[PDB]
Amino acid sequence: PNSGTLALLLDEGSKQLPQAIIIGVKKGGTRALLEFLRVHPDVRAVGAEPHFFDRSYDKGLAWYRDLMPRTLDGQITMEKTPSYFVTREAPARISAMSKDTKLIVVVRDPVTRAISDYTQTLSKRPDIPTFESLTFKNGLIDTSWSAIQIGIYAKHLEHWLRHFPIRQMLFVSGERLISDPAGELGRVQDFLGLKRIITDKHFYFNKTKGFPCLKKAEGSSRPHCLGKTKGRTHPEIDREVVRRLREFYRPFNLKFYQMTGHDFGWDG
Amino acid sequence: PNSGTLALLLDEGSKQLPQAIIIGVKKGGTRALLEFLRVHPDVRAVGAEPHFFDRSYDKGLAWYRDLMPRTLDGQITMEKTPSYFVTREAPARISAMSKDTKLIVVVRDPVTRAISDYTQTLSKRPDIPTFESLTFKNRTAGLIDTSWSAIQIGIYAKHLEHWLRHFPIRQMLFVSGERLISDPAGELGRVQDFLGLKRIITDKHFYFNKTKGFPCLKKAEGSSRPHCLGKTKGRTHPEIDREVVRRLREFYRPFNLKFYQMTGHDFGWDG
Numbered sequence: 033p034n035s036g037t038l039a040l041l042l043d044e045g046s047k048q049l050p051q052a053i054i055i056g057v058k059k060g061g062t063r064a065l066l067e068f069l070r071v072h073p074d075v076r077a078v079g080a081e082p083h084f085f086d087r088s089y090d091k092g093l094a095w096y097r098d099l100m101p102r103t104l105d106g107q108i109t110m111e112k113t114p115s116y117f118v119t120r121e122a123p124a125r126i127s128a129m130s131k132d133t134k135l136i137v138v139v140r141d142p143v144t145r146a147i148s149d150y151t152q153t154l155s156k157r158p159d160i161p162t163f164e165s166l167t168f169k170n171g172l173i174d175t176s177w178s179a180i181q182i183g184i185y186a187k188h189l190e191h192w193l194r195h196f197p198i199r200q201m202l203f204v205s206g207e208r209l210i211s212d213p214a215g216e217l218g219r220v221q222d223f224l225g226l227k228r229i230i231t232d233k234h235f236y237f238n239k240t241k242g243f244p245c246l247k248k249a250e251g252s253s254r255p256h257c258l259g260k261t262k263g264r265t266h267p268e269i270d271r272e273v274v275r276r277l278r279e280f281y282r283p284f285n286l287k288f289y290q291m292t293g294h295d296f297g298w299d300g
Numbered sequence: 301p302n303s304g305t306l307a308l309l310l311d312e313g314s315k316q317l318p319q320a321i322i323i324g325v326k327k328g329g330t331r332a333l334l335e336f337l338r339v340h341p342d343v344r345a346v347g348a349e350p351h352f353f354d355r356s357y358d359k360g361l362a363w364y365r366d367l368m369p370r371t372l373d374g375q376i377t378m379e380k381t382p383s384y385f386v387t388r389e390a391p392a393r394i395s396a397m398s399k400d401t402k403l404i405v406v407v408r409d410p411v412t413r414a415i416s417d418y419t420q421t422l423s424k425r426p427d428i429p430t431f432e433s434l435t436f437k438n439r440t441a442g443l444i445d446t447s448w449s450a451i452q453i454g455i456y457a458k459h460l461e462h463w464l465r466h467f468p469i470r471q472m473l474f475v476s477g478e479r480l481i482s483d484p485a486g487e488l489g490r491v492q493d494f495l496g497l498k499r500i501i502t503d504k505h506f507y508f509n510k511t512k513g514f515p516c517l518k519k520a521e522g523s524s525r526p527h528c529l530g531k532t533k534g535r536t537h538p539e540i541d542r543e544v545v546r547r548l549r550e551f552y553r554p555f556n557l558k559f560y561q562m563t564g565h566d567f568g569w570d571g
């Protein structure tokens with residue numbers, strides 16, 4: 033930055049606690065949503081996952097605020113930590129910071145999310161058993177397995193609704209974020225009270241990677257596709273296992289659609 | 301950047317000759333316009349002024365093309381060199397590259413443009429004579445020295461005739477330098493339409509800096525933080541004798557009027 037620019041932020045720029053937070057879900061497409069949102073002139077976000085409300089709460093709200101980027105009047109401050117959604121104390125802690133906090137949750141077909149979760153662990157520990165092996169406690173599904181538990185969105189949502197009004201929560205379609213990024217970002221910008229700037233022209237589908245990419249990133253004049261850890265190849269899962277998992281989640285999915293008022297199409 | 305990213309441009313992108321060029325005018329507000337346009341996801345531009353059509357033409361179109369950034373389909377390639385507008389051979393040369401090239405000219409009140417031009421030189425050559433001095437060939441008779449570049453550049457209508465002998469007025473856009481300052485989002489609206497770009501750059505992309513006295517970008521291209529133009533953009537002008545300013549405005553009036561008719565727009569420099 034240059035003289036005038038620098039000084040400007042040192043005089044009119046100030047750090048705010050996040051007015052909006054992407055609280056989940058793990059493997060739902062949280063990085064994608066945040067990177068896309070960062071294109072907007074009125075959005076500033078912490079680059080890394082703070083993990084303040086789940087891991088580092090013992091550091092104080094002052095430590096949290098200093099982590100926030102400086103913003104000019106009109107700009108929203110944001111951060112994303114996928115684990116918040118399933119953190120028992122998160123709802124209460126965030127509300128305490130501010131009951132007016134807007135919450136965004138990027139959801140994904142519970143089955144593909146579980147496999148994605150598994151695939152990420154496999155990349156870190158190649159010796160773990162097969163996905164099929166971990167899925168079953170027996171023909172009984174091992175619901176104590178985090179990969180399965182995180183997918184029961186309705187269950188986690190009930191906890192959040194004890195501290196927040198459904199209207200302060202936005203549920204983003206992880207699948208549509210991929211098939212129609214501008215579409216979902218439109219809903220997100222409205223929810224956040226931001227003028228609809230991010231549009232179709234901000235994206236470019238990368239055939240090679242199989243996912244859309246930003247034609248221009250916030251931190252670059254060049255295009256930007258998410259890294260190699262985003263969009264991992266999943267192992268082929270036994271169809272019978274996929275069938276049983278889908279059947280297990282279905283009741284919870286339909287309940288989730290009812291609670292949120294939206295059918296995400298994971299069941300047709 | 302990362303693997304997939306880089307690999308993308310090197311595979312699906314390429315360097316193309318600019319489909320649109322900001323050709324002038326000096327001190328009209330050419331840097332501001334280009335920096336604002338760069339916010340658009342479908343615009344890629346050369347950072348510096350190439351000065352190809354005026355100074356390095358001998359290097360050929362291939363060298364010129366290689367100076368351009370790599371673009372993805374749908375993105376427009378641009379550059380700005382303020383001197384092109386008053387460069388004798390520029391019209392013919394740009395036309396030979398491509399008859400369909402779009403041209404943008406950021407104009408400004410010829411009097412303030414002249415004073416701005418003088419001030420720039422003054423900042424680099426502090427011992428030059430006064431503006432009033434260089435303005436007249438003969439002060440008493442009121443004979444204005446039209447050979448002086450600061451005055452010459454401002455006779456827009458005459459330079460424009462040279463361009464219209466190689467380009468149809470429809471392929472040229474005249475941007476109000478004054479409005480660019482007072483309502484950048486408004487001006488950028490016209491520019492994007494002219495360039496066939498979706499109107500994305502809007503009011504929210506700007507932030508007025510009270511200290512600098514000019515609008516700034518809330519976010520600059522490739523940067524998450526604000527961005528005002530540097531110290532060389534928006535210089536304080538020395539006070540000019542009122543009589544001299546009046547005589548200069550008197551000199552430009554007729555040419556301004558012809559320019560308004562030629563462009564189909566009254567830029568408001570004469571009331």
Ligand SMILES: O=C(O)C1=C[C@H](O)[C@@H](OS(=O)(=O)O)[C@H](O[C@H]2[C@H](O)[C@@H](NS(=O)(=O)O)[C@@H](O[C@H]3[C@H](O)[C@@H](OS(=O)(=O)O)[C@H](O[C@H]4[C@H](O)[C@@H](NS(=O)(=O)O)[C@@H](O)O[C@@H]4COS(=O)(=O)O)O[C@H]3C(=O)O)O[C@@H]2COS(=O)(=O)O)O1
Pocket residue numbers: 325326330331348349381382383384417418419420421424448449450451532533
């Ligand atoms: O990105 C930008 O927009 C930008 C960033 C820089 O901060 C800024 O540098 S600055 O220090 O000058 O502010 C930079 O300025 C460019 C400018 O945009 C160019 N204008 S253009 O030529 O119209 O495209 C250009 O301007 C200078 C010219 O190179 C120079 O020509 S030459 O002499 O080098 O051949 C020209 O000189 C004029 C002079 O201005 C006149 N004085 S007057 O009082 O204004 O009339 C007079 O003396 O005549 C000479 C020669 O005219 S002739 O060539 O027609 O015979 O004007 C220069 C100028 O006005 O600054 O380059 C500068 C960069 O200049 S630098 O010193 O190399 O940094 O824009």
Ligand SMILES: Nc1ncnc2c1ncn2[C@@H]1O[C@H](COP(=O)(O)O)[C@@H](OP(=O)(O)O)[C@H]1O
Pocket residue numbers: 057058059060061062063064114147148149151209210243244245257258261262263264265
């Ligand atoms: N443009 C994009 N590029 C890469 N991955 C994207 C994407 N849009 C959505 N995603 C999804 O984001 C997931 C990662 O989510 P998170 O960032 O919350 O961990 C990826 O899971 P997979 O790796 O299983 O495909 C991928 O499906």
Ligand SMILES: Nc1ncnc2c1ncn2[C@@H]1O[C@H](COP(=O)(O)O)[C@@H](OP(=O)(O)O)[C@H]1O
Pocket residue numbers: 325326327328329330331332382416417480481514515516529532533534535536
């Ligand atoms: N947002 C902005 N910040 C700074 N200068 C701007 C600007 N918008 C327009 N300008 C104008 O751009 C002029 C420079 O034009 P160019 O970049 O073509 O040389 C400046 O002349 P002054 O220095 O006389 O104010 C200034 O008036």
Ligand code: NA
Pocket residue numbers: 148149150151152153
């Ligand atoms: Na995992």
Ligand code: NA
Pocket residue numbers: 416417418419420421422
């Ligand atoms: Na000058």
